[PDB]
Structure 1
Amino acid sequence: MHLTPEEKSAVTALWGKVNVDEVGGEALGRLLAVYPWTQRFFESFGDLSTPDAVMGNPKVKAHGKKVLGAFSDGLAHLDNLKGTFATLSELHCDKLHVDPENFRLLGNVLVCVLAHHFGKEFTPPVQAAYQKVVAGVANALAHKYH
């Protein structure tokens, strides 16, 4: 996590404009639809057969919001991601058995989502700050795997 002060300000200024409810649902839905293999963890979510079925599924929307919720909290402790995410890392490993590569795919999808929403405001340099952040979060979420 080599976030220069200016990189950190930029992450924070944009995150100010995000509707986590909204972004959360879009990022999760899009993951399930671009990398269908990731659907393996959600067979109790119901119908994920098409993008419409995925994007609109009330369960996916609700889970996305939860996920981004935890992510937002992360953004307030950019200094201590490992600490912030420790119990969550243990849970994903020990209970959910989620392959950490999943954390990197979601990060990329999230970046595309931010680009989708902010248009021209998601400048090359802002993307680079967010790339460091999604990677820092994925690493923090994988730190307790064993």
Structure 2
Amino acid sequence: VHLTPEEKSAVTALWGKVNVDEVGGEALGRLLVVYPWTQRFFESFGDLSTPDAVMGNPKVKAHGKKVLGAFSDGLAHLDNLKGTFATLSELHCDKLHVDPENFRLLGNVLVCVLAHHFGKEFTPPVQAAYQKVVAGVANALAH
């Protein structure tokens, strides 16, 4: 990762304005719409056929709130990501059997959601910092 302190100020300063509920479930719902094979991992969440029932499924919104809980824990622990996501890399790579490419996909989807909620406030250096964060979280879950 190794964010410069200006990039830590842009990550922290932009993340302090992130609504939890919309960005989490919106990001996971955009996985399940854009990348539909990921829907084989969420077979218990009821309807995931139509995109409007993906973006209105309450379990996708609550689970996405859990996912931004984990990204928030990743942003409070930018040096010890390998230490932080060890339980979650065990859960995603030992119990759930998720191929780690998918984690990268969710990270990129999250970045799209961030642009979708910030526009001109989401500059290419802010995006570069969030690609370092996203690749840090994906590589941290890759164990």
Q: TM-score, normalised by structure 1?
A: 0.95
Distance 2:106 2:67 in 1: 10
Distance 2:69 2:16 in 1: 14
Distance 1:8 1:140 in 2: 19
**1:22, CA displacement in angstroms?**
1.6
Distance 1:131 1:71 in 2: 13
Deviation per CA, 1:58-95: give whole Å up to 9, x if none. Answer: 11111111111111111000011110111111111111
What is the number of equivalent residue pairs in this alignment? 143
**1:99, CA displacement in angstroms?**
1.2
Q: Where does the alignment leave 5 or more consecutive residues of structure 2 unmatched? A: none
**1:121, CA displacement in angstroms?**
0.1
Secondary structure class of the residue paired with 1:56: coil
Deviation per CA, 1:17-73: give whole Å up to 9, x if none. Answer: 001122101000011000111111011111111110100011111111111111111
Distance 1:5 1:12 in 2: 10
Aligned residue in 1 for 2:19: 19
Distance 1:5 1:80 in 2: 17
Distance 2:96 2:47 in 1: 21
Distance 1:56 1:49 in 2: 11
Secondary structure class of the residue paired with 1:46: coil
Secondary structure class of the residue paired with 2:79: coil
Distance 1:86 1:43 in 2: 25
**1:2, CA displacement in angstroms?**
2.6
Aligned residue in 2 for 1:101: 101
Runs of 4+ in 1 over 6 A off after TM superposition: none
**1:134, CA displacement in angstroms?**
0.3
Deviation per CA, 1:90-121: give whole Å up to 9, x if none. Answer: 11111111111111000000000000000100
Aligned residue in 1 for 2:88: 88
Distance 1:94 1:48 in 2: 25
Distance 1:87 1:52 in 2: 32
